[PDB]
Amino acid sequence: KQYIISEELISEGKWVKLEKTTYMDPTGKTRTWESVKRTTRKEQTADGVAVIPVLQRTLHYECIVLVKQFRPPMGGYCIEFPAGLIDDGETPEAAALRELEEETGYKGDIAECSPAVCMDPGLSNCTIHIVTVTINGDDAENARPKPKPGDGEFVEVISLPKNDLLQRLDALVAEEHLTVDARVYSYALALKHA
Amino acid sequence: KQYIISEELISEGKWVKLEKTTYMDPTGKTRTWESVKRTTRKQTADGVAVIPVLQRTLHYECIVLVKQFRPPMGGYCIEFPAGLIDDGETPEAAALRELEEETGYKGDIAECSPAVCMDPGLSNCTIHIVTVTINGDDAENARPKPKPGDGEFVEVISLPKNDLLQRLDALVAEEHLTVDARVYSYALALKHAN
Numbered sequence A: 001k002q003y004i005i006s007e008e009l010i011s012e013g014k015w016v017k018l019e020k021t022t023y024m025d026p027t028g029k030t031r032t033w034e035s036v037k038r039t040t041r042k043e044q045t046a047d048g049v050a051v052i053p054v055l056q057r058t059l060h061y062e063c064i065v066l067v068k069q070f071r072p073p074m075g076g077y078c079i080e081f082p083a084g085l086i087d088d089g090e091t092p093e094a095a096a097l098r099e100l101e102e103e104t105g106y107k108g109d110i111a112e113c114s115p116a117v118c119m120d121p122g123l124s125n126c127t128i129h130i131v132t133v134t135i136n137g138d139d140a141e142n143a144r145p146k147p148k149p150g151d152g153e154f155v156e157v158i159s160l161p162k163n164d165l166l167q168r169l170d171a172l173v174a175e176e177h178l179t180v181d182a183r184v185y186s187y188a189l190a191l192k193h194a
Numbered sequence B: 001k002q003y004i005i006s007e008e009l010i011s012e013g014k015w016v017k018l019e020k021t022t023y024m025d026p027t028g029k030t031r032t033w034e035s036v037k038r039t040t041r042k043q044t045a046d047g048v049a050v051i052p053v054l055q056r057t058l059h060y061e062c063i064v065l066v067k068q069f070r071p072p073m074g075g076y077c078i079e080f081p082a083g084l085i086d087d088g089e090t091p092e093a094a095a096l097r098e099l100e101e102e103t104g105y106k107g108d109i110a111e112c113s114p115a116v117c118m119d120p121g122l123s124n125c126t127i128h129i130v131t132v133t134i135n136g137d138d139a140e141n142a143r144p145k146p147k148p149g150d151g152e153f154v155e156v157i158s159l160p161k162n163d164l165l166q167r168l169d170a171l172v173a174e175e176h177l178t179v180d181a182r183v184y185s186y187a188l189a190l191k192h193a194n
């Protein structure tokens, strides 16, 4: 029933643009919306990846590896899954593995890859693949992992036990001014609810 | 260590604005970022998302989701019921109200997240994630009455919580929808738990 009629550019930056979207509602009436899109998306199946990195070590509880960074749009520090945009021609899996190593130091093994999922679909067209990766924390490669952050990237690694993730996130939010990402929080909630 | 120095308006619509953010990087170098903000925030957060756990005796426990046309996405998406928090509304009340408008179910609050970020590399958008149980054996949830506002056109999709990730993947494979990332994240953790 519903579909896009036209997309009119309002303002275009280097990284983001705003568009006036005209679409057909399901009663046959023309309506409009204000849409956000990234300027960087080309032939990629999604803008980005986020990595769910399960760190596995013998005689350790499995940890979820998370990153803490300053996010200018938020005016603050945020706790997120490791994540980055997919480079042109790069596979979501390769981007996941690369972004994980860059942000955390860890070399993971691919477990699973989602289809393209939407980040905030009432606002933007941004999509990611959510890539589950296991990290062999016994392997010497992953012993004393060093983040190789890029030009103007600055990341702290926080590994939390999967079996206590939600309380461990709550405890971090209690100590300081910082925001948890909605995907991380949804994942931690479902761990509790299972 | 890092912080905002100034924000320059680039373009302001009715619903969304685009800003150029200047910030101090942790080396003491001044850097810029393109940031999206909603023009509606008053409030703990912009919006709520509801995790609606439909509990009926002798049936699998279901998670209740909604399917809508999303003009920024140019297509249909599957999402937790959700909407913006009205001025002077609590997140808890916004959650029950949105859940009722979008699904017709009347539910009870189990828990409520702190404000969590939606896409912090792009926007300052936040939500409260509100876990709600629905007593599907209660008379008021027999024939649920979805009362959508002006311009919302919502389909309800309840899926068993214990097979949620496979059910979603099926829908994406069969019906060319986009699953929301918070929805997919929750679904993953339900598989990853234990």
Ligand SMILES: CC(C)C(=O)Nc1nnn(C)n1
Pocket: A032, A033, A034, A035, A122, A123, B015, B016, B084, B151
């Ligand atoms: C349905 C109302 C509450 C709304 O959020 N409308 C809208 N139109 N463009 N953007 C972005 N958002």
Ligand SMILES: CC(C)C(=O)Nc1nnn(C)n1
Pocket: A015, A016, A085, B032, B033, B034, B035, B121, B122
């Ligand atoms: C670090 C690079 C890849 C980046 O995403 N820069 C940027 N600047 N404004 N937005 C939005 N995003």
Ligand SMILES: [Cl-]
Pocket: A193, B053, B110, B131
């Ligand atoms: Cl529950």
Ligand SMILES: [Mg+2]
Pocket: A082, A083, A084, A103
């Ligand atoms: Mg990143």
Ligand SMILES: [Mg+2]
Pocket: A083, A084, A099, A102, A103, A150, A153
């Ligand atoms: Mg990166």
Ligand SMILES: [Mg+2]
Pocket: B081, B082, B083, B102
């Ligand atoms: Mg809604």
Ligand SMILES: [Mg+2]
Pocket: B082, B083, B098, B101, B102, B148, B149, B152
């Ligand atoms: Mg509504």
